[PDB]
Symmetry: D2
Subunit: 235 residues, 4 copies
């Protein structure tokens, strides 16, 4: 076919999709025609989305959340690891706890979901693991020794998973957004490093996720898709 | 806002859209709903698309092509610099001519089209400059001193253009494909027979439609905040630093 | 001025410098003229170098290790975070425990030393934080979801540290070795590297010739990790 | 295994554009290391402290004769430092074909001419160090540099295609990418200063030493962290 390939309704799970960027991702994938499930830490999801409670720092809860999703919409085919936190501080001011808590949620939590999803993904010969990284992973925003390390670790993990599982139809990619609006960052002068001279919207991030979850990205593995308006350009 | 944004039919120009990857890009963008024009060198436009004869090594011809496209479908809003060639040789065997003609077509030829389009793109506060690079730009396929230099140069040019014009709604990005199947017959791919699959984690070559899928995303409304990016369509082949 | 800059003896700490690549780095920096200390886990440092007992998974041991180094040879000016482990497994067979202990040693362990070192480096306006990464960080060696994440995480941490502290003379860089003798189909050099070659790149990042280098990934891999 | 610095080996060095600027500092450093250093010039005359040959990197015949004169004076080139380069900045709308191609022919194609001319004897001798002088703008993309950034980014792709082909024969190709070197930009420089020519020459001395045999296709940024990104 010359046009867009035929659409396939995928079983989607968006971790941390109860608000913010994760909510816009989940609603975009639902409007695309997918079967979208989201996770929350207890407060619940909006009415328009199927929600399950899950803390990505608890391996038993991650396995428990996948069980509900498999029972509701089938085994997860597209994982969007979006849950994450930030604990910024100067290097000498950053404690061990504020470092490990960012690592455990942003890095290790994304591994727990990708490992739990890889079971059915290998047997069904299909899988889309989409980590939500950040420009800070390769650009290195100051006062983010923990956040920049976790977001950069997503690139290494996604590429180690891709080099193993791409032959079995399972790819792992990373969406790296810049400053996204969901104002103090603008007051501190963040616009000076963004060539687009504006912040991105959550819907623009969801547009990149919708691409990686569609039938137009089956030959894309280990990629870092920057949604930063040119902020993270470099090496 | 929640779903896919409202579609805008863009004036599209695809260099080298008569065969290969460029033909798939032109057909995909037309099926998306864009006003698609292609450049050729005598064969003419495919399907019902609009065609202009243009060799990207001739600035006078590039200006002439943009003038005819402007009259037919309005000024070019989305440029897909797809025209390219290859002249492989060992470093000690590569001549000055075979190095420069690859540079003049793949790198300079992309500049001629990108420079010619920038004027109206800055007027209308919109512009999508999509370069068709290669995995060899950053991965460095052997015997490609000229080809890898031209494809890597597309990244630097796209990022210099983006840092200057992204504030005016004009962005430049690069699609870097890996080994893509462009065979017209059932014959075996000679690159595959040479062991190309040993470097592709996907263990298969890509299709021209998959590259066109990546170009369709960059030309759509879902990529307005993407500038200076390299989109690898290589099955994980070019992973590294 | 035109030649090599005048040498300055720095206080060096090399984590895990009792054997392997860390030992070759310590001997190289000692031969350069640095005051070289190394951390061990009870095996004892070679009688040629100053040794402190430290497990990089323990913040209290890290704080005590730097404390003993400051009293002996002055506060650490050049930190070489070399201590690291590997626990490979297929993604479907890698456990949470196997993932976290690789992260805790390679990534979090390197942060504990860098965070402790920045206490005195930032005040004296000189600092060289040199992380020993791996080609797998950006190349993504298979069966290393934990290892590649930790090694790629060193890049983001070094660049975040650099953007904050480069203005104060404190820089952070990563040395990313390939396969080092202590697979050749992806190595253009068609051979493996040696520990002395890794130590040669560390010697450069710890010398007076690398004061303007920050957030850099220096690959010592024979070209294996070329890409993007 | 030797624990200290490896025994120094004096190489035959050629530094293009080593008559002034960064190239002059690179050549004086490599000569101070112990190498036999020759530089290229374009009639102004090499400085009184270095052997000079006349060569315009846009002329393949002049490059061929330059390596001939270097070989007759100090042996065939073992370490090549492609330093010659120009910049013709302009906005994209204002950049002409002549202005674009002039920067490409000198910075990119001129680096290929020297790299091609030295490649054969490097392969036969099983040793070769091709060091291209790139720029932060290659991967960072400084504005008004559609020609300069394309040329400096092309040096990376060429060096990596050369390395993947010839690293097995002991011939590596690397790129030193300096930031702003003194020979409003401080906002993007985490070091909050500009570099010196001696700091770029220090990185070249490393890539030309016995401590960089296992480094191929690398980009060594000397920018104070300016080009950090992806
Ligand atoms: N400018 C930006 O906002 C920006 C830029 C680049 C990257 N990102 C990344 O994009 C992702 C979301 O962006 P955002 O703007 O929406 O920030 P956010 O609002 O703080 O997103 C956090 C989400 O993750 C969930 N979550 C947090 N910790 C969790 C845990 N331990 N277990 C399970 N779920 C957990 C939260 O649920 P609760 O509501 O219950 O806490 C919430 O849904 C993050 O990973 C962030 O790093 C954001
Ligand atoms: N595996 C792959 O195929 C692969 C991988 C990575 C990147 N790419 C890139 O993708 C693009 C197209 O790939 P392809 O496989 O389809 O190549 P192709 O089949 O040989 O066709 C390339 C097109 O470029 C046109 N062209 C060449 N030189 C031109 C010039 N000076 N002026 C104008 N048009 C010119 C050709 O027109 P004519 O018919 O008149 O010759 C043809 O339409 C190239 O830039 C290539 O580098 C390809
Ligand atoms: N091919 C390679 O060798 C290669 C390639 C790329 C990168 N690297 C990196 O280079 C570094 C060293 O390489 P290697 O070959 O020398 O490995 P190695 O021979 O196994 O030595 C590892 C060193 O780290 C120490 N260590 C490990 N975990 C520690 C902890 N929790 N606390 C304190 N010290 C700890 C070990 O101390 P003990 O003696 O008590 O065990 C030992 O001194 C590692 O970070 C590795 O990832 C190696
Ligand atoms: N901020 C910086 O300075 C900076 C930053 C990044 C990279 N670089 C790179 O560093 C290198 C050194 O340049 P520079 O900073 O020292 O400025 P420069 O003073 O203008 O040096 C340019 C040198 O290149 C020679 N040259 C130019 N075109 C030539 C040609 N066609 N054939 C032969 N030689 C030619 C010049 O010789 P003549 O005397 O005859 O003109 C001169 O020796 C350049 O390649 C530049 O791109 C510089």
């Amino acid at each position: 076919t010359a046009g867009r390939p035929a659409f396939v309704s995928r079983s989607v799970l968006v971790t941390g999709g109860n608000r913010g960027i994760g909510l816009a991702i989940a609603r975009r994938l639902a409007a695309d025609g997918h079967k979208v499930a989201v996770t929350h830490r207890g407060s619940g999801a909006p009415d328009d989305l199927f929600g399950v409670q899950c803390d990505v720092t608890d391996s038993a809860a991650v396995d428990r959340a996948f069980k509900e999703v498999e029972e509701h919409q089938g085994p997860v085919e597209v994982l969007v690891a979006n849950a994450g936190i930030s604990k910024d501080a100067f290097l000498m001011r950053m404690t061990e706890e504020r470092f490990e808590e960012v690592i455990n949620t942003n890095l290790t939590g994304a591994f727990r979901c990708a490992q739990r999803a890889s079971r059915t993904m290998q047997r069904k010969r299909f899988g889309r693991i989409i980590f939500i990284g950040s420009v800070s992973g390769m650009w290195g925003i100051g006062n983010q020794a923990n956040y920049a390390a976790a977001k950069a670790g997503l690139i290494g993990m996604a590429r180690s998973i891709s080099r193993e599982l791409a032959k079995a139809g399972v790819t792992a990619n990373v969406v790296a957004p810049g400053y996204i609006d969901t104002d103090e960052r603008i007051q501190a002068g963040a616009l000076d490093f963004i060539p687009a001279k504006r912040v991105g919207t959550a819907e623009e991030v969801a547009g990149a996720v919708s691409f990686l979850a569609s039938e137009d990205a089956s030959y894309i593995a280990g990629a870092v898709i920057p949604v930063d308006g040119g902020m993270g350009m470099g090496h």
